Amino acid sequence: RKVAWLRVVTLAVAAFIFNTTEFVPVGLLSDIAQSFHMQTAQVGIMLTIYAWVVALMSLPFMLMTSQVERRKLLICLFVVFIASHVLSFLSWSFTVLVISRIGVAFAAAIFWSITASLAIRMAPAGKRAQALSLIATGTALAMVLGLPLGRIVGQYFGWRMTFFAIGIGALITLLCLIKLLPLLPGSLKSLPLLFRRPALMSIYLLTVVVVTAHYTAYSYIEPFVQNIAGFSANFATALLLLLGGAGIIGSVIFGKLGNQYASALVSTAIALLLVCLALLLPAANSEIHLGVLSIFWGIAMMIIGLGMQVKVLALAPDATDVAMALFSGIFNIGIGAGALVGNQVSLHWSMSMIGYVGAVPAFAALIWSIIIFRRWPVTLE
Ligand SMILES: CCCCCCCCCO[C@@H]1O[C@H](CO)[C@@H](O)[C@H](O)[C@H]1O
Numbered sequence: 001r002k003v004a005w006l007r008v009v010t011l012a013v014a015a016f017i018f019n020t021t022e023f024v025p026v027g028l029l030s031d032i033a034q035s036f037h038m039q040t041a042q043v044g045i046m047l048t049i050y051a052w053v054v055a056l057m058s059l060p061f062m063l064m065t066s067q068v069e070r071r072k073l074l075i076c077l078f079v080v081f082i083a084s085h086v087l088s089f090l091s092w093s094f095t096v097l098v099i100s101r102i103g104v105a106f107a108a109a110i111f112w113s114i115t116a117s118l119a120i121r122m123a124p125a126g127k128r129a130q131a132l133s134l135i136a137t138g139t140a141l142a143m144v145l146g147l148p149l150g151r152i153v154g155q156y157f158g159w160r161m162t163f164f165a166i167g168i169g170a171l172i173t174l175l176c177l178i179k180l181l182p183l184l185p186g187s188l189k190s191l192p193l194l195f196r197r198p199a200l201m202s203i204y205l206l207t208v209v210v211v212t213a214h215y216t217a218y219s220y221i222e223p224f225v226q227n228i229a230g231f232s233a234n235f236a237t238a239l240l241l242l243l244g245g246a247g248i249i250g251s252v253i254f255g256k257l258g259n260q261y262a263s264a265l266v267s268t269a270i271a272l273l274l275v276c277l278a279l280l281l282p283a284a285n286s287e288i289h290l291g292v293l294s295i296f297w298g299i300a301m302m303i304i305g306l307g308m309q310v311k312v313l314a315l316a317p318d319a320t321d322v323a324m325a326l327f328s329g330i331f332n333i334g335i336g337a338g339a340l341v342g343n344q345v346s347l348h349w350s351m352s353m354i355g356y357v358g359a360v361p362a363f364a365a366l367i368w369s370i371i372i373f374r375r376w377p378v379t380l381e
Contacts, residue, residue, distance in 0.1 A: 007182070008127065013169075020150055021150075022104070023142060024166070026222060027148065027150055027154070028150065029220070031155075035158075042343065042347070044339045053106070058110075069114055075177065079174070081104060086167055088163040089160045144244030194316055194319060205368070209368070212341065214358070215337070215338025216338040217355050219342045220354055222240075243298040246295045251306065259381065260379070264373075315376065
């Protein structure tokens with residue numbers, strides 16, 4: 001009975017680990033830049049490399065791993081994951097670190113498909129939803145607590161110790177899995193149908209554009225706060241914690257408002273995001289200005305996320321799985337797209353302009369957002 005609750009809790013902690021690793025390079029960019037004598041912007045590629053790999057490869061991986069989803073696949077994953085983190089610990093060239101990130105990406109690609117599927121199969125019927133809420137909470141604890149813990153463990157002991165501590169969480173959980181996995185062992189034909197419905201494909205587009213805006217600025221926030229506002233390294237840590245809390249507030253704001261205003265919430269939130277990206281550099285002349293702007297930014301992108309999610313949910317009630325898969329796929333597509341353009345703008349123009357540049361896709365989203373929310377006003381309840 002409480003056994004099953006533990007198996008869900010362990011899949012959730014594994015989600016925590018996989019997302020803290022997926023996020024924390026933002027918090028470690030400058031330490032990594034120093035430690036290889038290069039610009040923080042070029043590491044943005046490690047941000048891009050992982051995300052685009054995860055997106056494009058999760059489908060062929062989840063495809064080739066389709067036969068044995070037994071704890072064998074989990075253990076194989078966790079072995080590959082802890083190994084990659086261990087290689088990041090000992091990286092002697094940025095090229096090495098990028099390779100290690102690629103390994104984390106393969107692990108995450110297979111982990112996510114398998115873990116989504118597995119959290120339910122190991123829990124009772126009423127916990128079929130609560131189990132979802134658990135591993136989701138893990139990912140929340142990932143961006144809310146996980147990124148700032150990783151960044152402070154880097155401030156103390158090197159980002160090598162950051163990645164090391166993460167692999168260590170992975171190891172104790174691989175053990176837990178071996179000692180709790182129950183030896184436990186295809187909706188892809190849906191895929192062309194979704195590719196046909198214009199509403200769903202247009203939500204996919206709107207996501208890609210807004211997320212490219214957001215990650216164009218966010219990917220390089222730590223190097224921004226230090227190198228351009230001139231502020232401390234601890235202050236960057238405060239901002240990452242603050243973004244987490246604002247995501248908590250955006251969740252409760254969204255949960256309070258309800259889905260009647262979902263389209264509205266989102267479109268207005270995209271407006272907020274444009275404001276934040278426009279006002280990013282001006283808010284640097286003072287510390288408290290960037291603090292306000294972080295609260296607003298975090299609430300905004302949280303509400304945008306929850307809204308796009310609800311929209312893909314309502315636009316494909318027949319294939320919730322494949323749509324959320326395509327969803328995280330195009331989402332990581334945008335994560336890497338934003339990091340890549342942020343890299344390009346940091347390298348060729350000043351990094352001080354990322355916020356300004358970022359507003360350009362955001363605006364597009366906003367306009368498009370308004371348009372498409374006029375046209376398919378469909379939601380959940
Ligand atoms: C079906 C065609 C291709 C589908 C590809 C689907 C898998 C994409 C990976 O999704 C992952 O799931 C988690 C959900 O939170 C995220 O935290 C993680 O960052 C995200 O990368």
